[PDB]
Amino acid sequence: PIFLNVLEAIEPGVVCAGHDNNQPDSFAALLSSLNELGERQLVHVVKWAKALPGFRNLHVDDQMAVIQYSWMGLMVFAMGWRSFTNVNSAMLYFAPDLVFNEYRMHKSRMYSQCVRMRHLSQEFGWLQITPQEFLCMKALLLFSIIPVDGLKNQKFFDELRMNYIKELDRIIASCSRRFYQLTKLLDSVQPIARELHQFAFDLLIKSHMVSVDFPEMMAEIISVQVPKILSGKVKPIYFHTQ
Numbered sequence: 001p002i003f004l005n006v007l008e009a010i011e012p013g014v015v016c017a018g019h020d021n022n023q024p025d026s027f028a029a030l031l032s033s034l035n036e037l038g039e040r041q042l043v044h045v046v047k048w049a050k051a052l053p054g055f056r057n058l059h060v061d062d063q064m065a066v067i068q069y070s071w072m073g074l075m076v077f078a079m080g081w082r083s084f085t086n087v088n089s090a091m092l093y094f095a096p097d098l099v100f101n102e103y104r105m106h107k108s109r110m111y112s113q114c115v116r117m118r119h120l121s122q123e124f125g126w127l128q129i130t131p132q133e134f135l136c137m138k139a140l141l142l143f144s145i146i147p148v149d150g151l152k153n154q155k156f157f158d159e160l161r162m163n164y165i166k167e168l169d170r171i172i173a174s175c176s177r178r179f180y181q182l183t184k185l186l187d188s189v190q191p192i193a194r195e196l197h198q199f200a201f202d203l204l205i206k207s208h209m210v211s212v213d214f215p216e217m218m219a220e221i222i223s224v225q226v227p228k229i230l231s232g233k234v235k236p237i238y239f240h241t242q
């Protein structure tokens, strides 16, 4: 299990949001901590990414690019998994110190979005998703969204991505049935991340006017990279269209 050793080895540990659970909830309190968390998880995603088989093989610009476009969806998927495994999909386990109940779901003004994420969480359960299958899947999510014009080295990227599908397929092996389900589940992540993108973006735009704080690294990705996703420039790669 060489490849599976790696994915296991490199999987991020616990990441806290820094939130104050003793102070009553608040739109700005909540979304300030989520933003905070976004930042930290982003840092973790970068270090994880750069330890993937094949990854540092990409043009350094393709690296920053793929990390920045895939970031939200990667966070969404892992958050779904944690939610599934730590609290039976009942609530959303953003972090140890930031767990969303219905109340926070509403109060963060992210109710509809929290609903889809919560549903994705339940899918892990419904589909009896193994932790091994969760790792390959997540790994594959990093190769899921690119500029329509392609990347600086697009060929190396497709060979990479090809190899990751192959690895998902081995980790499965009507195995045809199993793959279909897992690929449909992977496709489902993009609509949620797109919804999350819209919300983050709108939030940025109005943020000095509401009291939410955006870490510098966040605000750059939301203002520079996210609009390309929202404008159709950077599109997701789907298994089944759509």
Ligand SMILES: CC(C)(O)C(=O)Nc1ccc([N+](=O)[O-])c(C(F)(F)F)c1
Residues within 6 Å of the ligand: 031, 034, 035, 036, 037, 038, 041, 072, 074, 075, 076, 077, 078, 079, 093, 094, 095, 117, 196, 200
């Ligand atoms: C930009 C916005 C408010 O920060 C945001 O979506 N934050 C955020 C932080 C962490 C996590 N997480 O995966 O644990 C997520 C989300 F993936 F759940 F959406 C969003």
